[PDB]
Curated annotation (Swiss-Prot):
Its EC number is 2.7.7.7. This is DNA polymerase. InterPro entries: DNA-dir_DNA_pol_B, DNA-dir_DNA_pol_B_CS, DNA-dir_DNA_pol_B_exonuc, DNA-dir_DNA_pol_B_multi_dom, DNA/RNA_pol_sf, DNA_pol_B_thumb, DNA_pol_palm_dom_sf, DNA_pol_type-B. Signal peptide: none annotated. Belongs to the DNA polymerase type-B family.
Amino acid sequence: MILDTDYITEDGKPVIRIFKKENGEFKIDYDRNFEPYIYALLKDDSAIEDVKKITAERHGTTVRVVRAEKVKKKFLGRPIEVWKLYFTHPQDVPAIRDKIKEHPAVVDIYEYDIPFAKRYLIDKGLIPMEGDEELKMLAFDIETLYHEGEEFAEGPILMISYADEEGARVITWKNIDLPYVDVVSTEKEMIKRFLKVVKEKDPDVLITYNGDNFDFAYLKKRSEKLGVKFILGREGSEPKIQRMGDRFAVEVKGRIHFDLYPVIRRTINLPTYTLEAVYEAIFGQPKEKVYAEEIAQAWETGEGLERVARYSMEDAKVTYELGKEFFPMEAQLSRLVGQSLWDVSRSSTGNLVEWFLLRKAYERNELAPNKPDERELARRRESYAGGYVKEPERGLWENIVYLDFRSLYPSIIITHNVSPDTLNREGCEEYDVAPQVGHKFCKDFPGFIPSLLGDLLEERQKVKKKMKATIDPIEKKLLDYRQRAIKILANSFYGYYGYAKARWYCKECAESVTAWGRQYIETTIREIEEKFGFKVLYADTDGFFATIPGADAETVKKKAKEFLDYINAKLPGLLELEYEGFYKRGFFVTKKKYAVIDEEDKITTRGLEIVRRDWSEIAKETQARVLEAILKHGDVEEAVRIVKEVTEKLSKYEVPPEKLVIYEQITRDLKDYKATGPHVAVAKRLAARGIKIRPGTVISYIVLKGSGRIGDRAIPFDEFDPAKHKYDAEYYIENQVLPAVERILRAFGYRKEDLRYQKTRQVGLGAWLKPKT
């Protein structure tokens, strides 16, 4: 299968490179005959003779149009005739571009900024990674000594750990005796060793968590100092530190640097993307806890090195796991969009759609619109949105069903043939009118995107069909991923329409789709209420929760499914409402905030869980415990009593201190946080330890009863000595526990003052509450 493509330049001529792995064998194919080009729409063909002579300079070398060829294409649903202008090197384009475009007979140019190595995949009709070649992967992580106040990588790498199917290990130059640890003499031999292992294992994939903006840059700066040639690429080249947004991204020629960060930060979303938090959100299991202080302690004390070496092998093992978890999925997106996994991996969904349309545009001979110039980019102001939102019936309800539309937006885009090339077409004989903004979309001819989406959804339904009939759980999961990639892509079109950098950008389309969305959801809610006696408890954009007051659970389910048949028979085209599931109870705080429980006693919440970077078990637990009382036991009063007891136990120091440990990923040097807060004290505590914690790291501390502002005295959990150190109950009550439960109970008529008894050392200072939460 094709892994990736690039090109090198020999004597000013581009040579495309195709990295492959066929029959478990690596190989690099070359192509010296691919010519870069652009299209030019002229007012009159006679101007081509002028165009064919346009010239530009490039490092003293004269750049010229190598050849012209008039071709017929489709653009904006109307046939168009433009000239395909060829050149020698992709980099000549930018230099000759502006001049050609400046010619009076040139209406304008197109497809003049599509990267050569991608243009190649699209044009040559190649698809990265088809088949199921077993790819060998490898993850790694490093541990470093922070030297606050100095240039990047001023301190040394103490450990380099990695993991794969053959287990995990740790290479280090510190004094350690563990079966999985390799002790070398120096940071230098450590790194070289690490480089010998990789080249040894010859993995096709290198897995890391945020390796794009740290690990590779660190390994590079250290190897630069220690005079080590940081070679990892099958090519023999060092990693390439290409920059993207305000970030960077590393690429290893011949292999695939799969950085889990961009990917995971794309799939799910939750507060703090610490590898710790992330890991658990994906496996519903705890990862071995972090001890940034103990690690830094091991560096200076030398005591605890065994435990620390164990933490690194853990980090690598976990990382390889997250990688063996997300790579399959990403592989499918890559195959679907038609670009490298390296690219698809670090791409916004808006750009994912873009490369898909470009590939389709080629296959269907559709000219691609250009990207918006700088001023146009200004003109494309968002601020517009608006899905149907119904203020919830607060309180506790039972026998609830969740019903939602099947791919609401795509379905709308398809059935109403919504796209730029169908918008307000002159002399249109058949058209649908957008509910709001009243744009007219022609139906005399299927639109470019609508047609594409339509095929996509049909391909999804088809793969699902084979998935369910496939008995082998192996190919089943494969088809499963294929089916999910399509979902992810199709769900990205609505967005793409209003995406500023979009070639096929179209505000009218986005607005109309949103407008149709509201109408359908509104139409469906009227029916279920007037014709079926349902009570819609909550609704948002493409789905709603409903019940039948006083009705049996079987009745509600049976009635809801009878409603589906009824309604789907009235909805136009692809618009369809589905039974998402059943819930015994659920309650709605307010729009976007709710909790429900299925017949498996599983609680799904929304807009209720944790918020910031500083959480604790005591908070996690108490909230969970509150949701259980209300939804499992169905007793709002047991929940309030639970908060009050936890409050009591905290004021009587009867709460175990390890449930009070606060974990926080620092975003700056502790030494430099606001004067108020525990950070400064912790910093000074660690500094006495001679420790310096690198921002981004996860700190573990406890707030104690001090002699100043509450929450201002805190120490790392390490130094917590029960006999000499007592925690600030007021801080855990007001800053942690209560804010993690105050909104939920407020929804049930309970004011803050009701969650803590009258005489409970109350300090009447709800100032400790999490700021602007």
